[PDB]
Amino acid sequence: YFQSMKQIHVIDSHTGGEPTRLVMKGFPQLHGRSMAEQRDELRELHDRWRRACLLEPRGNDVLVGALYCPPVSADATCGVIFFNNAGYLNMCGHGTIGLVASLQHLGLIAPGVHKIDTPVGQVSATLHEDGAITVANVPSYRYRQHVAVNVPGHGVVHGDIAWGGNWFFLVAEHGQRIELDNREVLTEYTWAMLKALEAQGITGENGAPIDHVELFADDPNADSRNFVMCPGKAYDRSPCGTGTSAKLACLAADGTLAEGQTWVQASITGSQFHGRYERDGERIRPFITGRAHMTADSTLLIDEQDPFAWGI
Amino acid sequence: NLYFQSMKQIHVIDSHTGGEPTRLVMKGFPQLHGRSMAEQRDELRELHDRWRRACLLEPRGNDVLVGALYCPPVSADATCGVIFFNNAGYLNMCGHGTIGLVASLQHLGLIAPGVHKIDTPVGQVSATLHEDGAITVANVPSYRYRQHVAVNVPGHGVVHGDIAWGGNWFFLVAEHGQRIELDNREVLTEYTWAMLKALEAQGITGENGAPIDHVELFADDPNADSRNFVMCPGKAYDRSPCGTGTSAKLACLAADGTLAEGQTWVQASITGSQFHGRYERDGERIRPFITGRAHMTADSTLLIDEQDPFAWGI
């Protein structure tokens, strides 16, 4: 009977609490030569597979899926296509940490530098001997500093606007408590803040929407703790790789963090990433280190008689 | 493969009942010495709560999930015992989870169609596995307490609802002003949550002052007798038609004579899943019977990494 249903072999993991569903077998054969072609193929010809994995009931609003692919470039370990319950992603830092940890435990890679092919080019990740993984983030920078926004029901706040692979508004939050049991308040506040930025025409470079907000506060045992609001009104359980890269860019620009020095960023759940940077013109090269842990080895089952087989 | 067994493992079968998911634990929890399900449930809560938490807290679980521990039977009559739980604690009964259990046991080769008795921490629940795979559960006795009660909900003026017990207290509204559609769930959530606050503020309760903690809205449907939206504690909506809520609905239909004894009511949910319901009379109350289906969604080995600060849940 189980043998009768369509099967998808996945390895679920989390990176600082933010989960990754790595698909190792069961999606359709993709004939695209490039990772972008394969991604387009999935989206256009085979989207039910993403949806079965990411929509309810099998998925949720925080999960990212990752399709393992054979490498396309000569020196890459593999290819990957990331996706969530709304569509396809291109890069995904926490998912890449999940991927590399998973591949290690499956016996497919050893410690060292690994190149991973994505739809938008290669990502370099270093698997350390102790199992931590460092992602070379895209070049990051601060676009504007100390920008005012009025947030309905809360008042005026100032933040930096910075690119770390996504656009962020970064706020030194003194008013609200950055603790996990205050998450519903922080969720409503930061979501309102995102909507207020849009309404007030506050954007990244060349009008790009700011679709992430991150709040920072002191922490007794890290350099900082954050609360990160993402698309879909979901907070990041992790310190957020691109968001921490954007923070490093701001710290670098202000001189708060020296080149080569380590910044320890705690998340709302108490997980941590380490980061450091090198300067490169008006930008920085950020390096974000974190860990992933396995949480399930699972055969997803698709009952083709279920109206919700491919997700709700 | 040696690494995947540096890790503690829990074998689960995940399924959903009309969209509402059940995680059935088939192996990996500690041995329980309780002679009864109530004692075993107490054992879990008191001596072994990390297992529930690994399964139901993030990252492995979520707010919608219910877990069910499979247990060897303890009443002589029984196919098995079960203990239900969610990310907050232990439940007693769980109709949708029982449908999940029975469907899962069938697919695992443990049972065949027929009547199956299942031991629970509050005694038995009887479930019929039909030849076509559907499963009928007997809900607790249900009844309407009050009829056509007014509540003022700011932004809506007065709404009327029935107050009925189906295992929980519900306020049941024939909703003509709100669109009962999944893409309108945000608006429906704010409305029903406001309605619960207004009932409380205006002293509208169940029997003996019991708080009403569920609201269900009902509308016409072109392929069912009705479609609903069901608001539950924690500001959560039921993906399914809701077993206890549909039982409360049956009690109101029976009281008004809208549904005849033995006749079937087809209740669609916000997600477009459906249950069937019928009742028999029990003095001034009813015995409701809820029929639905569960579908398998995963056969999974949960893995616990000892080096993981979140191994046992966030």
Swiss-Prot record, chain A:
Q: Which reaction does it catalyse?
A: trans-4-hydroxy-L-proline = cis-4-hydroxy-D-proline
Name the residues that bind substrate.
Answer: G93, H94, H212, D236, G241, T242
The protein's superkingdom reads: Bacteria
Provide the E.C. number(s) assigned to this enzyme: 5.1.1.8
Task: Mention one GO molecular function.
Answer: 4-hydroxyproline epimerase activity
Whether Secreted counts among this entry's keywords is: no
Keyword annotations: Isomerase
Write out the similarity annotation.
Belongs to the proline racemase family.
**Which PANTHER family does the record cross-reference, listed alphabetically?**
TRANS-3-HYDROXY-L-PROLINE DEHYDRATASE (PTHR33442:SF1)
| Protein's name in the database | 4-hydroxyproline 2-epimerase
- Organism in which the protein naturally occurs: Pseudomonas putida (strain ATCC 700007 / DSM 6899 / JCM 31910 / BCRC 17059 / LMG 24140 / F1)
Q: What is the lineage of its organism?
A: Bacteria, Pseudomonadati, Pseudomonadota, Gammaproteobacteria, Pseudomonadales
UniProtKB/Swiss-Prot annotation, chain B:
Q: Which residues form a coiled coil?
A: none
Where does the chain bind substrate? G95, H96, H214, D238, G243, T244
Q: Which domain of life does the UniProt lineage start with? A: Bacteria
The species this protein belongs to is Pseudomonas putida (strain ATCC 700007 / DSM 6899 / JCM 31910 / BCRC 17059 / LMG 24140 / F1)
Which top-level enzyme class is recorded in the Swiss-Prot or TrEMBL entry? isomerase
The family line of this record is:
Belongs to the proline racemase family.
The UniProt record lists the keyword Transcription = no
Q: What molecular function does GO assign, one term? A: 4-hydroxyproline epimerase activity
* Catalytic activity from the UniProt record: trans-4-hydroxy-L-proline = cis-4-hydroxy-D-proline
Identify the keywords attached in UniProt to this record, alphabetized.
Isomerase
> Briefly, what is this protein's role?
Catalyzes the epimerization of trans-4-hydroxy-L-proline (t4LHyp) to cis-4-hydroxy-D-proline (c4DHyp). Is likely involved in a degradation pathway that converts t4LHyp to alpha-ketoglutarate. Can also catalyze the epimerization of trans-3-hydroxy-L-proline (t3LHyp) to cis-3-hydroxy-D-proline (c3DHyp), albeit with 200-fold lower efficiency.
Q: State the protein's name.
A: 4-hydroxyproline 2-epimerase
E.C. number(s) listed in UniProt: 5.1.1.8
